[PDB]
Amino acid sequence: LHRSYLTPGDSSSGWTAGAAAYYVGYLQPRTFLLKYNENGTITDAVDCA
Amino acid sequence: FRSSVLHSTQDLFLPFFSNVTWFHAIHVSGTNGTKRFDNPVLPFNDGVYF
Amino acid sequence: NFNGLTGTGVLTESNKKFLPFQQFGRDIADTTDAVRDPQTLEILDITPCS
């Protein structure tokens, strides 16, 4: 979070554009048809639900 | 390893086109002056796409 | 019997550039084909024992 220094005048309202945003989703028991490539990498998936 | 095959697996994956909780967290200099951010505790049901 | 992949077969040289993290190597009909050398990084595809 960096208390460090706040430099009043430029960040008076906290922030305007945005520093970062972390996403937290939740995994669910799902059936995934995985398509493997000739190199062994997954290119696309399909969820039945 | 699997070379150009189709495989079906039953595990815990993130469903497509769902609702993910973007949580913006950073120093927030308040109008009064007290600095805060977005900070609670997020539960870990059985997995997290962080 | 490599790292526990017990089986009989002819171990030949393979063009199976495995993604850098796998080891078992199976098929669609779930047959345990290519296996990576536990010691070195060589991949020998197995075949039926004639």
UniProtKB/Swiss-Prot annotation, chain B:
Protein name: Spike protein S1
Resulting phenotype, residue 10 to H: In strain: Omicron/EG.5.1
Start and end residues of each stretch annotated as Disordered: 25-38
Outcome reported for the amino acid change (mutating residue 25 to V): In strain: Eta/B.1.525, Omicron/BA.1
Annotated effect of mutating residue 41 to A: In strain: Omicron/XBB.1.5, Omicron/EG.5.1
Subunit structure: Binds to host ACE2. RBD also interacts with the N-linked glycan on 'Asn-90' of ACE2. Cleavage of S generates a polybasic C-terminal sequence on S1 that binds to host Neuropilin-1 (NRP1) and Neuropilin-2 (NRP2) receptors. Interacts with host integrin alpha-5/beta-1 (ITGA5:ITGB1) and with ACE2 in complex with integrin alpha-5/beta-1 (ITGA5:ITGB1). May interact via cytoplasmic c-terminus with M protein. May interact (via N-terminus) with host bilirubin and biliverdin, thereby preventing antibody binding to the SARS-CoV-2 spike NTD via an allosteric mechanism.
Glycan-modified residues: 19, 32
Organism: Severe acute respiratory syndrome coronavirus 2
Effect in UniProt of substituting residue 38 to A: In strain: Beta/B.1.351
Role: Attaches the virion to the cell membrane by interacting with host receptor, initiating the infection. The major receptor is host ACE2. When S2/S2' has been cleaved, binding to the receptor triggers direct fusion at the cell membrane. When S2/S2' has not been cleaved, binding to the receptor results in internalization of the virus by endocytosis using host TFRC and GRM2 and leading to fusion of the virion membrane with the host endosomal membrane. Alternatively, may use NRP1/NRP2 and integrin as entry receptors.
Region of the whole protein represented: 43 to 92 of 1273
